């Protein structure tokens, strides 16, 4: 039903894969190698000349957040109403902003910029702890009473930052319990422990 | 008014949502934040991500310009007529956001040394929108479906500021050109665009465009 077209890395497809798995969905992975990409035809056929590319029936989508939002809308992972939907987007956009800063670090100046990035991290993670504290004491989800698509994206972002800076969640009790809680959902837990996830590099330049 | 926009005195990331509100005949309050106020630090520390725009829809307080655009798109019916169009609208907006981030990097961090390469790469960055437009009714109406969506105000602002950055950049794209003309002629939007409230605000905060 679903097909994910992407390079052999977790990157911008980790969240959407976690979402599919946790939700019991089935999908096909169409892996694109660098040689295949450098050939030029696939790229030229992509709307924005980039991956991921996603297929749902005969609907083809581009843009990782468009895919996440589409799955959130069709599978009911977008809040109970417009008010919560706006809050879900606010969380996702906040995640996207930090993922971009992370990507810039990883691909453009890991070596010289890592120390400054790590020092600024607490202040970049805190907004999510505050959001959790404002909804049911942070005991359940970040928005409302049900999981939303933005949470798979936030979970991946937290997971890759713990790799980048072990212990970065330690001073954030709500985020820490949230990560353990989400990571324990049965289907998500199996997915996170599987080779499909574990043996795929986080990024394409071997940095993390 | 049920809406309040809190931002610096620039068009920037608030131009598209303002256009949307004006084009939809909605009322809103403009709360202007000066640089001195910002440097004072307390408004900033109270902002969810330490940044503006901040938006209030009654007691619903939002941050993130695209969260605000999506919210208004959802509450005003500018988000497609079904799930498939909603996804396409999002795809347009995410593409707009990506190019806006590049424009922003150019403007604030590398104007002098980067403008040549930026402009040379610009046609390749605009083409996807021409392609999207060509695939919907021959590009004679909206970018997605048969009604206007929130992404379009964002796309229109993006195209307008790029024409200031690179005069004639749209001459290579017939559909985008006529599209801009079309949207810019909507009565309420046209009036807004020619008004002091829009015209007397700089596009960016460092004086470059
Ligand atoms: N805004 C896009 C960004 C996609 C992107 O940066 N894709 C990269 C891989 S992470 C790519 O396709 N690179 C190959 C190229 O640009 O030629 C999204 O969120 O999906
Ligand atoms: N992803 C955010 C970005 C917001 C942003 O970059 N805000 C800038 C002004 S355009 C800001 O508040 N700068 C002040 C600061 O960071 O201290 C959005 O789309 O709203
Ligand atoms: Ca409630």
From Swiss-Prot, chain A:
Q: Does the keyword Acetylation apply?
A: yes
Domain (GST N-terminal) ranges: 1-79
What GO molecular functions are on record for this protein? dinitrosyl-iron complex binding; fatty acid binding; glutathione peroxidase activity; glutathione transferase activity; JUN kinase binding; nitric oxide binding; protein serine/threonine kinase inhibitor activity; S-nitrosoglutathione binding
Gene3D superfamilies the record matches? 1.20.1050.10, Glutaredoxin
> Could you tell me which residues carry Phosphotyrosine?
2, 197
**Pfam families named in the record:** GST_C_3, GST_N
Which keywords does the record carry?
Answer: Acetylation, Cytoplasm, Lipid metabolism, Mitochondrion, Nucleus, Phosphoprotein, Transferase
Q: CDD domains recorded for this chain?
A: GST_C_Pi, GST_N_Pi
Domain of life according to the entry: Eukaryota
SUPFAM superfamilies (alphabetical) = GST C-terminal domain-like (SSF47616), Thioredoxin-like (SSF52833)
Protein name per the record? Glutathione S-transferase P
Q: From what organism does this protein derive?
A: Homo sapiens (Human)
Organism taxonomic ancestry: Eukaryota, Metazoa, Chordata, Craniata, Vertebrata
From Swiss-Prot, chain B:
- Please give the biological process terms from Gene Ontology that the record holds: animal organ regeneration; cellular response to cell-matrix adhesion; cellular response to epidermal growth factor stimulus; cellular response to glucocorticoid stimulus; cellular response to insulin stimulus; cellular response to lipopolysaccharide; central nervous system development; common myeloid progenitor cell proliferation
Task: Name any one Pfam family assigned in the record.
Answer: GST_C_3
> Domain GST N-terminal, which positions?
1-80
* Sites bearing Phosphotyrosine, chain numbering: 3, 198
Amino-acid positions noted as binding glutathione in the UniProt annotation, renumbered to this chain: 7, 13, 38, 44, 51-52, 64-65
Per the record, residues carrying N6-succinyllysine are 102, 115
Q: Does the keyword Methyltransferase apply?
A: no
Phosphothreonine occurs at which residues?
A: 61
Q: Which residues carry this modification: N6-acetyllysine?
A: 127
Q: Where in the cell is it found?
A: Cytoplasm; Mitochondrion; Nucleus
Q: Where do the GST C-terminal domain residues begin and end?
A: 82-203
Enzyme Commission code(s) on record: 2.5.1.18
What does the UniProt record report as the effect of altering residue 113 to V in this chain? In allele GSTP1*C
Function of the protein: Conjugation of reduced glutathione to a wide number of exogenous and endogenous hydrophobic electrophiles. Involved in the formation of glutathione conjugates of both prostaglandin A2 (PGA2) and prostaglandin J2 (PGJ2). Participates in the formation of novel hepoxilin regioisomers. Negatively regulates CDK5 activity via p25/p35 translocation to prevent neurodegeneration.
Q: Which family does it belong to?
A: Belongs to the GST superfamily. Pi family.
Q: What is this protein called?
A: Glutathione S-transferase P
Q: What is the lineage of its organism?
A: Eukaryota, Metazoa, Chordata, Craniata, Vertebrata
């Amino acid at each position: 039903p679903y097909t994910v077209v992407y390079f052999p890395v977790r990157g911008r497809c980790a969240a959407l894969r976690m979402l599919l798995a946790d939700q019991g969905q089935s999908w096909k992975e169409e892996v694109v190698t660098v040689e295949t990409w450098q050939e030029g035809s696939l790229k030229a056929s992509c709307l924005y000349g980039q991956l991921p590319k996603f297929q749902d029936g005969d609907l083809t989508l581009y843009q990782s957040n468009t895919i996440l939002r589409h799955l959130g809308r069709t599978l009911g992972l977008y809040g109970k109403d417009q008010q919560e939907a706006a809050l879900v987007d606010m969380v996702n956009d906040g995640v996207e902003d930090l993922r971009c800063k992370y990507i810039s670090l990883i691909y453009t100046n890991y070596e010289a910029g890592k120390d400054d990035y790590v020092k600024a991290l607490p202040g970049q993670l805190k907004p999510f702890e505050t959001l959790l504290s404002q909804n049911q004491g942070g005991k359940t989800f970040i928005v409302g009473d049900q999981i939303s698509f933005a949470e798979y994206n936030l979970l991946d972002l937290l997971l890759i930052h713990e790799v980048l800076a072990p212990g970065c969640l330690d001073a954030f009790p709500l985020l820490s319990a949230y990560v353990g809680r989400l990571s324990a959902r049965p289907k998500l837990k199996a997915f996170l422990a599987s080779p499909e996830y574990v043996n795929l590099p986080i990024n394409g330049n071997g940095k993390q």
